[PDB]
From a paper:
Ribose-5-phosphate isomerases catalyze the interconversion of ribulose-5-phosphate and ribose-5-phosphate as an important part of the pentose phosphate pathway. Two types of ribose-5-phosphate isomerases exist, RpiA and RpiB, which share little structural homology and have distinct active sites and mechanisms of action. Although RpiB occurs predominantly in bacteria, here we report crystal structures of a putative RpiB from the pathogenic fungus [name]. The [name] RpiB contains the canonical open (α,β) Rossman fold, a common fold for proteins that bind nucleotides or nucleotide-like molecules.
Numbering used by the authors:
A (entry chain A): 3 to 162
B (entry chain B): 4 to 163
Amino acid sequence: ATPLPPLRLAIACDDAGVSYKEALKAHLSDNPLVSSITDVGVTSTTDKTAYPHVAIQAAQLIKDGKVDRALMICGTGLGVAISANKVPGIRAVTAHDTFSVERAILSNDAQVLCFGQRVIGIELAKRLAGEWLTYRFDQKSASAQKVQAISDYEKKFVEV
Amino acid sequence: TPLPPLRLAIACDDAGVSYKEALKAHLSDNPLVSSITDVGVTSTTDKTAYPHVAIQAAQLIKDGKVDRALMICGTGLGVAISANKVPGIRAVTAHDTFSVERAILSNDAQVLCFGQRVIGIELAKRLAGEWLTYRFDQKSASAQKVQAISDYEKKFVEVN
């Protein structure tokens, strides 16, 4: 069935990302490269919970080994990416083109992909999310040494 | 100029050099820029990894030396991830006019990143120009969300 192992995903959004979230969730449920989707929420546009909370929660699922990656939607995709990058060991991007989406994995080993619902169209979002799943980072690559410099910097800090 | 000029840092890896030179030239003529500090690299020969230049530029903001940084690499992703690891720094990759505006007005993001291999130079110049014309409102509702990120960052302490 699948040449590549399926990934476990978290999906998450703020009130501005609800509709693309549901369409993307349905689209990805049909994909054999996805073995599970955990919905962090929000579930409704009335829910005014701020983007940092949701982004940090979804990133914590990755940190705890409960999912492999997270797909995050807000107005622009910016706030959730900033917030997820604040979690030690988590690398997050907003990527709105096919080349960036490939490099987000192959160069940056980024576990979190963020979209701006108000900025890109749904079919492009679906296409990008689908392609994202087909790339797997090489830990022995030249790119991994650069990622290691980010991790080296993160070693400056401890949680108190 | 009706708005105060800003001090800028600019940075790139080897993949971002020609766009950095072009942007620097374009911005040096802009009355909204009071100074530009170029942290490098200055040649495609210089293989210094993107995290070092991004962290150096981000530290200039942290240390009150510049107001904002413009960073260029192949995709703009690696430098944004790197910059977001620096405490109190918020960085975006933003390749459209709506996202650039929201980066400032919603996210108070001091760092803007471009992918030389992903966007065209005229669009990059136009976006960097528009970026300077927005100023974050510290009294806004968006400031509460920004403070939420800042509060998370206080869980970590720099030991090294």
